[PDB]
């Protein structure tokens, strides 16, 4: 079955993907070659314009992404070519600074080589391939509690964190072969973080908040017409609400919105002021007003549905079906005073796409 | 298979509710009963206790209420009995009264006589009981738009507005065998309505807001055992967001976010500046602030999700299933500062229950 598979989803992506490239005419043959180099060999090899734009097709795919309107300005980055630790190591530094580009964040993907029988080329232990270390000795609670396995595992390995509440975790990632995986070190000068500051209220630097620049997410598969790319690191820029009201409002997150609270000067006693809603308000203001003033992009929530309803819109004129999930697209703060809240979305699952794997620790 | 179905439904109802009120040894007889009474008369009627029963149960399975934890409190009016047009009137003067309880709002409902054979007893227009007209005339907006459609039937039936933004609409409804609905202006003495101030802001009262005290939901439909009480309005009292966040922030409401930004002093210009976000915020603490200070009865959107938890952990303890619809369930601002947000809820639908009707004008 599962080279009917394999030849089922390669037939499927094909077709839709030279169709939207013009080159319906070329369907035939390269449908031929591919029937019998999988016949031959197991599997076959993407050409290089059928792994990048069938990496734009899974990010237009993706029902939970709001920002999906740039789909087609992905930059992807075909390194199938790496066969040592070194390379990969090498070409996750270069994906950092080529995304980063001094603030100008550029959206983009790394694509490592595939499973081959299911057996992983390059295995990838990071979440995100920058991310805040937690830890939790005798009830006290230091850093990001969501990076609290992936910590224990590094310091498993041989690491030690300076237990800061921000302590960079290395990368970690195994290669076929090995037993135990590598892992090196985040050199300072690659990571860009934004100090939280507020536009008015100047002791909101009290709280010596920072986050970093570019999240870039090292964990998920991209699968392209039958193809699992398990290691495929991709970055797009943040919006504001993820950070100021998720990963620092979430209790168990940073837990921030009573220090908020205090630093604003309003009580954090009854539920009827909506101190946390103000809360939360004043310190997603500090998180945009910081990344913009340094120079790091970002975006808000209210531009950002603006911009997936031109992404709606275009779907429709270009004849495709539009598939998304509702329920991660309304933003965590004022969600009623954007459309998507006001609609429905079909959550069907459309291919190419991104989709979760399980984790190699824990 | 209409017998069938009601005898099917009557199977299930009396079988649950007996049981929870401990009454399980009288199922058989109650059933026999209800068998003759079928076959004779081609429906049954429902005893005090098992309407008052039904009535509440129907509110326990009301997957979209986040105020379910007093499901066993309401307090359940059987009108059966009203043949007349000056009955039904008077019936629902008498539940705006008694609900509203000098602003102290009681869980209320009253059940007017069901469908015979789908044929309507008595037929509500009203979407609320108490609720503000809306017009539009030359792209002038008055009052509630959502008013628009019912607002311009009354005025169809010779009820003229004063066309104020806040025009109380009449009661109207149709009884079995008119060809037209009655209407009747609400009295003043019966309706509380609160100014919206805010705790700190002095200037926010020129903006001259105001809402009314209780919302008291009269179109929809109540199903238990399956009989179809098509009239039966029931009333709760209000979570602040209902109002701060919807009724008087809506694009297509009342919209009032930008004069909300200018009378609390901050610019809405920049979506980066999270103007609306405060400005919800700031309405939604002159709301609660409000109905406090006069005394009327509402629960913010915090202390009623840790509410809905309890009403969750008592489901679990009593050994019934929880069913809920998540997209209602979150509030429409700092959805996920409430437990709500990150969990899941099965949408089955159980029965007894409430039911949307379609509107008998438009
Ligand atoms: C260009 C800027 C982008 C913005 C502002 C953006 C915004 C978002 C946001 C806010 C989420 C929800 C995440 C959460 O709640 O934790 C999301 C989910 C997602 N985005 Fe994007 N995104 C962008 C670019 C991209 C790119 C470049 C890709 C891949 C090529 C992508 C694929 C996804 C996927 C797969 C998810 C869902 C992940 C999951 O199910 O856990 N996005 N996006
Ligand atoms: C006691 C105070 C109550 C509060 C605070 C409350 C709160 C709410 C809220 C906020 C909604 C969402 C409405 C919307 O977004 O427009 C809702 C929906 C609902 N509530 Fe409650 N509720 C209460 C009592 C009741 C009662 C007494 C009943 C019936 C006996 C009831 C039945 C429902 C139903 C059927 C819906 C969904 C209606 C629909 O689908 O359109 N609730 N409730
Ligand atoms: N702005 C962003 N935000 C973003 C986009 C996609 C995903 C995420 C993280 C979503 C998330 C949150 C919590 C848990 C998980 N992962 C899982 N539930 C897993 C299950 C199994 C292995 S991981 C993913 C954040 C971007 C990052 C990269 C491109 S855009
Ligand atoms: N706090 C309340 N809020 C509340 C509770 C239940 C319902 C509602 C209104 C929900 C709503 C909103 C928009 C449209 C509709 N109705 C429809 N979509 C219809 C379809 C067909 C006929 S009406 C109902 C508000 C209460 C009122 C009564 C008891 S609690
Ligand atoms: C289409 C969308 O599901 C719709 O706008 C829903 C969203 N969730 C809601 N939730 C509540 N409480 N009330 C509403 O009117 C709505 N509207
Ligand atoms: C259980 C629930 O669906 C879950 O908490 C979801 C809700 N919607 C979300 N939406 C976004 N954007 N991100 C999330 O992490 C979640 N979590
Ligand atoms: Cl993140
Ligand atoms: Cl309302």
Redesign the interface.
Known sequence: EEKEILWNEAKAFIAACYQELGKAAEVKDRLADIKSEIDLTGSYVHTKEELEHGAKMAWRNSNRCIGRLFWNSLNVIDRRDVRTKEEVRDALFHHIETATNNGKIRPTITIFPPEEKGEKQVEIWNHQLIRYAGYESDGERIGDPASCSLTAACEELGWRGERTDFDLLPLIFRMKGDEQPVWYELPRSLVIEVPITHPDIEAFSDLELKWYGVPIISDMKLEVGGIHYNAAPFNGWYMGTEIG??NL??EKRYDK?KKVASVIGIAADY????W???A??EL??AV??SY?KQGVSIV?H??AA?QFKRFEEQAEEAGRKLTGD??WLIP??????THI?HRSYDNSIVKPNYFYQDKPYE
Chains 1, 2 share one sequence.
């Open positions: 009201a998720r409002a979430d919105l539920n009827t002021d909506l946390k809603d103000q939360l308000v997603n203001k945009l007003h913009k808000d209210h531009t603006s509702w329920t965590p703060i004022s969600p009623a005073a809240f």
